[PDB]
Write a structure and sequence with these properties.
The structure is cut from a larger assembly and holds chains A, B and C.
Chain A (H helix, E strand, L loop, with lengths): L6 E5 L7 H5 L5 E5 L13 E10 L13 H6 L8 E7 L1 H4 L9 E2 L39 E2 L12 E10 L22 E5 L2 E9 L10 E3 L5 E6 L4 E6 L7
Antiparallel strand pairs in A: 1-3, 2-4, 3-7, 4-7, 5-6, 8-9, 9-12, 10-11, 11-12
Chain B lengths: L3 E3 L2 E4 L8 E3 L14 E4 L23 E6 L2 E6 L9 E4 L14 E4 L7 E5 L3 H6 L1 E11 L4 E7 L8 E5 L9 E10 H4 L4 E8 L6 E6 L2
Parallel strand pairs in B: 2-8
Antiparallel strand pairs in B: 1-3, 3-6, 4-7, 5-6, 9-10, 10-13, 11-14, 12-13, 14-15
Chain C lengths: L3 E3 L11 E5 L10 E6 L5 E7 L6 E3 L7 E6 L4 E6 L9 E6 L9 E2 L11 E5 L6 E11 L5 E4 L8 E3 L3 E2 L5 E10 L8 E7 L4 E7 L2
Antiparallel strand pairs in C: 1-2, 2-7, 3-4, 3-8, 4-5, 6-7, 8-9, 10-11, 11-15, 12-16, 13-15, 14-15, 16-17
The chains are: A mainly beta, B mainly beta, C mainly beta.
The structure holds a molecule of 2 linked components (NAG-NAG).
Organism (chain A): Severe acute respiratory syndrome coronavirus 2
Protein name (chain A): Spike protein S1
PDB class: viral protein/immune system
């Protein structure tokens, strides 16, 4: 979608793998503000908004907190306190058709600097003076929605850069977007340390004959000591016994 | 607001960086937006528009055209110049209710100084039979447009009765042609014998005299 | 999406003429229809502005005297009627889209107290002595223009026809000259062909010393 109407999709209830994002080399710009790029896979957020558009390459730097410019002031403005990241990747071959693509257009003029995460579609003629426009384009009245101009042979700064700004919102509601939990292979008959889905413990993990109910995840004994657990993968019950200790 | 355009004419080599300037009478920027528009007009052609406002450019105008400025000072930029960009360029304002254009900024392909050849045409005898005499002074092509033409009759200077015509900047030889016509009645024409044209040009080391005796 | 402007005029001083512009492929509802005056030498200037959606007329004060601007919704046209006519107000009048991305082809409104009159063609004798110049003067012709050729187009090189000039009497003048080697002067025949359709005058005059 053109930058004058940036396409915003919300995402929730999904396990997001941001590792593939920065591990991929297609993206030219991966400036992430607020959150460390490596730690993105280890944070849980209530929801994530993906606002996508196409921009001129030379204006790609404008998409960030604290910068002014036509795209920043009149098309899409990020907050001063932004906790997210900005994917920006050149798409010269896809978006620059032969003869110049004119479908993508941007808002050059607007009476007031729009608030962060505001979208203005209204194709209303700008006053630009004291003249009553009355909906006709005059010397002072004109349409503030101009197409970029996308000839296939252009300067590299004028090429299409497709930009998606991932904005993470963490409300009071439970977080639904998280990174991959990851896993390790299981070792049975060794005094080890284990973290079964947040269950932190030590000991030897035998294969057990316990018949858990399907919903149950782990089992305690009398005096409430954890002595059994299903590994989340393969859904099989294990039996925990403490590492050998005694007096000498 | 009354605008002033400088220079009146400007010479370019094909592909040379070009700039033309305008001065405004008052401030043009209000509420952060300046409102002047500058036009190009090839001869015998409807003048188009290159800029919505101070700096931005309209769609359909090649990106080589640009401009910028503030207040009274404004200026274009035609960095790649070609044979098409040979025309007069006006500059508007939109602030006061009378919307005023500017003067004229002719763009010319630049060339080495070319000396003008001078020729004279006495009025024909059949033309005198009609009752009028028209003495013609011709410049046979020249690059530097500015030239001073003097009419002499029996070693006397004339004034106020000669009409001058100048052709446009030609595409291939890049030399203007000038014709000065002195129109007079037969009775006053026959009163003097020697008729001379003096040409002073910044391509000629000396003025050129083209003269004839009646006969 | 084009624009058309209709009517060459010669109407006598003091009258009024409503120059008409057909909008053609315009939307003629969201685009101001501007009126411009190109003075013959160079001087362009803004007549007035019309809002085709409503009909608002914003006009220059000095020309607010008798110039009026009208919009026709049926034909989507613009009619500029400048009441009272005078010699100085004889300039090209143009109509344009908004700021002027699309203009009309233009009309040459020429307030003239004179009348149609045929051109006079006179030979400008070849130079005495080498390259020599000869030709023809076309003088006292109305209305403009006059088409001058040489050998019915068989002589093109070295031909310079100057733009028509306006004289005191109100009649136009031009000079068509050609520069040729002296050896052709006594041998080659040069004829100027002058056509003035407004007076329907065709003259083929040979130039000889
Ligand atoms: C991990 O994904 C796999 C794929 O569905 C699941 O493990 C499969 O289990 C069946 C039954 O034992 C085997 O026949 C397949 O070979 C296994 N696939 C793989 C890739 O190992 C398993 O359900 C998933 N783990 C969960 C859901 O905790």
């Amino acid at each position: 979608a053109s930058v004058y109407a940036w396409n915003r999709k919300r995402i929730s209830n999904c396990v997001a793998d941001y590792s593939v994002l920065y591990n991929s080399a297609s993206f030219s710009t991966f400036k992430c503000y607020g959150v460390s790029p490596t730690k993105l896979n280890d944070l849980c957020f209530t929801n994530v908004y993906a606002d996508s558009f196409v921009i001129r390459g030379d204006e790609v730097r404008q998409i960030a907190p604290g910068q002014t410019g036509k795209i920043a002031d009149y098309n899409y403005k990020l907050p001063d306190d932004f906790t997210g990241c900005v994917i920006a990747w050149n798409s010269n071959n896809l978006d620059s058709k032969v003869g110049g693509n004119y479908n993508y257009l941007y808002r050059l003029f607007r009476k007031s600097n729009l608030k962060p995460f505001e979208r203005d579609i209204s194709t209303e003629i700008y006053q630009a003076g004291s003249t009553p426009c009355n909906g006709v384009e005059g010397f002072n009245c004109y349409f503030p929605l101009q197409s970029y101009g996308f000839q296939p042979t252009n300067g590299v700064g004028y090429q299409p850069y497709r930009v998606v700004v991932l904005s993470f919102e963490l409300l009071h509601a439970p977080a639904t977007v998280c990174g991959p939990k990851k896993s390790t292979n299981l070792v049975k008959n060794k005094c080890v340390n284990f973290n079964f889905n947040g269950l932190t413990g030590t000991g030897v993990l035998t294969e057990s004959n316990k018949k858990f109910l399907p919903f149950q995840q782990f089992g305690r004994d009398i005096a409430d000591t954890t002595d059994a657990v299903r590994d989340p993968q393969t859904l099989e019950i294990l039996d925990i016994t403490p590492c050998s200790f005694g007096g000498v | 607001i009354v605008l002033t355009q400088s220079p009146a004419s400007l010479a370019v080599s094909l592909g040379q960086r070009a700039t033309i300037s305008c001065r405004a009478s008052e401030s043009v920027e209000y509420y952060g937006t300046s409102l002047m528009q500058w036009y190009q007009q090839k001869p015998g052609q409807p003048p188009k528009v290159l800029i919505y406002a101070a700096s931005n450019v309209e769609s359909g105008v090649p990106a080589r055209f640009s401009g910028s400025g503030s207040g009274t000072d404004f200026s274009l930029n035609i960095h790649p110049v070609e044979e098409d960009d040979i025309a007069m360029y006006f500059c508007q304002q939109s602030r006061k209710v009378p919307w005023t254009f500017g003067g004229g900024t002719k763009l010319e392909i630049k060339r080495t100084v070319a000396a003008p050849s001078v020729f004279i045409f006495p009025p024909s005898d059949e033309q005198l039979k009609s009752g009028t005499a028209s003495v013609v002074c011709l410049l046979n092509n020249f690059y530097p447009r500015e030239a001073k033409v003097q009419w002499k009759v029996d070693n006397a200077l004339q004034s106020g009765n000669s009409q001058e015509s100048v052709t446009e900047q030609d595409s291939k030889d890049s030399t203007y042609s000038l014709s000065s016509t002195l129109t007079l009645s037969k009775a006053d024409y026959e009163k003097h014998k020697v008729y001379a044209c003096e040409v002073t040009h910044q391509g000629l080391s000396s003025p050129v005299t083209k003269s004839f005796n009646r006969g | 999406v084009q624009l058309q402007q209709s009517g060459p005029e010669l109407v006598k001083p003091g009258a009024s003429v409503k120059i008409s512009c057909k909008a053609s492929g315009y939307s003629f509802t969201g685009y101001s229809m501007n009126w411009m005056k190109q003075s013959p030498e160079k001087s362009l200037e803004w007549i007035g502005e019309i809002n085709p959606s409503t009909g608002g007329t914003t006009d220059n004060q000095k020309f607010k005297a008798k110039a009026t601007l009208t919009v026709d919704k049926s034909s989507s046209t613009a009619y500029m009627q400048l009441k009272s006519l005078t010699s100085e107000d004889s300039a090209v009048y143009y109509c344009a889209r908004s700021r002027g991305d699309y203009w009309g082809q233009g009309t040459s409104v020429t307030v003239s107290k004179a009348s149609t009159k045929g051109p006079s063609v006179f030979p400008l004798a070849p130079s005495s002595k080498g390259t020599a110049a000869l030709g023809c003067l076309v003088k006292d012709y109305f209305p403009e223009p006059v088409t001058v050729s040489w050998n019915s187009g068989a002589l093109t090189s070295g031909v310079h026809t100057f733009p028509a000039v306006l004289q005191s009497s109100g009649l136009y003048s031009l000079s068509s000259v050609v520069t040729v080697p002296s050896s052709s002067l006594g041998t080659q025949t040069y004829i100027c062909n002058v056509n003035h359709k407004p007076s329907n005058t065709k003259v083929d005059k040979k130039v000889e010393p």
